């Protein structure tokens, strides 16, 4: 047993039938010595007497909020949560597996630049009695500070009775060094409590691997009378500066309802534009292969 949070304890259980469980000793935080009784949740059934109560925690019927009384006088509370280990693996019921990039991906994080700010997302089907707690740091041996906000509902999809929820949290590194080559990854840790079940999740990464730039800004066309066009855009406002250091590379695409692609480090390009086509541009870090940005399009002609 370990303490998650004042008066909240987690009990680790190898979850299988006819399992011995854990012998837990609860203690009543009170200066009284005699007349103490114990109860669980809303049951009046007295489960024991004295300043302490020993219990064999095997199932969620043994979990819950234990209260100690001095007759009609309520004294203190101890909330027990279970972390079930099924088949030798901690349960992952609360969060949905996003299966991208690989299996058992429950948290996905993104950065728009090298500032130390990033956002992480996750999915769940649970609508009620759901609490999330987020913590983050760079490194484990000697952790460096990362400040995170509170997880909040970002999206919801409902089909009939099946509801799916998306949560997100914004974090930031305390002393970020945008130009440095990171040696220690960032760790994002998420506690998930639903009723009496406790689960937790982690994602380990370098900012450089979760970079996805914003789309190129102010995409424009200048025609020239064999029907060629001078395409021009600008770096997105959120990308790191100076651009002479944090360079982007671009892919310019011509597509209609056959493709023409050009790859350039410049913020301009010449393409042959046809009727009812569209000029699209997207961006990537020039020196390190991370995610491409979303396309930015402008109609042809």
């Amino acid at each position: 047993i370990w303490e998650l949070k004042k008066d909240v304890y987690v009990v680790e259980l190898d979850w299988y039938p006819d399992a011995p469980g854990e012998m837990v000793v609860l203690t009543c935080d009170t200066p009284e010595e005699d007349g103490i009784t114990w109860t669980l949740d809303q049951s009046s059934e007295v489960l024991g007497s004295g300043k302490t109560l020993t219990i064999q925690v095997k199932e969620f019927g043994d979990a819950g909020q234990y209260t100690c009384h001095k007759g009609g006088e309520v004294l203190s509370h101890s909330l027990l949560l279970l972390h079930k280990k099924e088949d030798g693996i901690w349960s992952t019921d609360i969060l949905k597996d996003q299966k991208e990039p690989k299996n058992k991906t429950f948290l996905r994080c993104e950065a728009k630049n090298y500032s130390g700010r990033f956002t992480c997302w996750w999915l769940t089907t649970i609508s009620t009695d759901l609490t999330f707690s987020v913590k983050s740091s760079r490194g484990s041996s000697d952790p460096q500070g990362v400040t995170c906000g509170a997880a909040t509902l970002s999206a919801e999809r409902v089909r009939g009775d099946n509801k799916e929820y998306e949560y997100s949290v914004e974090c930031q590194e305390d002393s970020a060094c945008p130009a440095a080559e990171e040696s220690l990854p960032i760790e994002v840790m998420v506690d998930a409590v639903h009723k009496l079940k406790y689960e937790n999740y982690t994602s380990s990464f370098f900012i450089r691997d979760i970079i996805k730039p914003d789309p190129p800004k102010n995409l424009q066309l200048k025609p020239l009378k064999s029907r060629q066009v001078e395409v021009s855009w600008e770096y997105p406002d959120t990308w790191s500066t100076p651009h002479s250091y944090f360079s982007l590379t671009f892919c310019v695409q011509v597509q209609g309802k056959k493709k023409d692609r050009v790859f350039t480090d410049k913020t301009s390009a010449t393409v042959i534009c046809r009727k009812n086509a569209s000029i699209s541009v997207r961006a990537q870090d020039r020196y390190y292969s991370s995610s491409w940005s979303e396309w930015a399009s402008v109609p042809c002609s």
Binding site: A179, A180, P185, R208, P242
Partner: protein, 140 residues
Amino acid sequence: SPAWTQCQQLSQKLCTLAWSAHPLVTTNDVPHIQCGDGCDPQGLRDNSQFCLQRIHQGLIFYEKLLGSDIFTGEPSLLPDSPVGQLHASLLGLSQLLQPELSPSQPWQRLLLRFKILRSLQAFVAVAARVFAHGAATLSP
């Protein structure tokens, strides 16, 4: 005096070769261009020699590392491996800056090679930003 545009090309050639590696059919031991190394844009303006000395040090380390038992021992690298060329381009870049481990299991050596090459992608990414920035702002 540094010859920024040659360095810019060699570090570009290293970004390309390093991302073409795939020996698998965190990296604890290597060097890194750290915050205190002064290779950010402002640090280059103020003391470019200090930064480029620490890039040179790391390049020498990666040369020696690629040219050692970790990479030259068994299991033999495959003829299509980029290690040999990276070695030549690392050597070439470190000369532009200034002219003058070892596990038992072979599966552990493959994994080690992968972590080193993955680490090199991060290192040369920063060096390329250094040489691109210096070519744009510190060249006469």
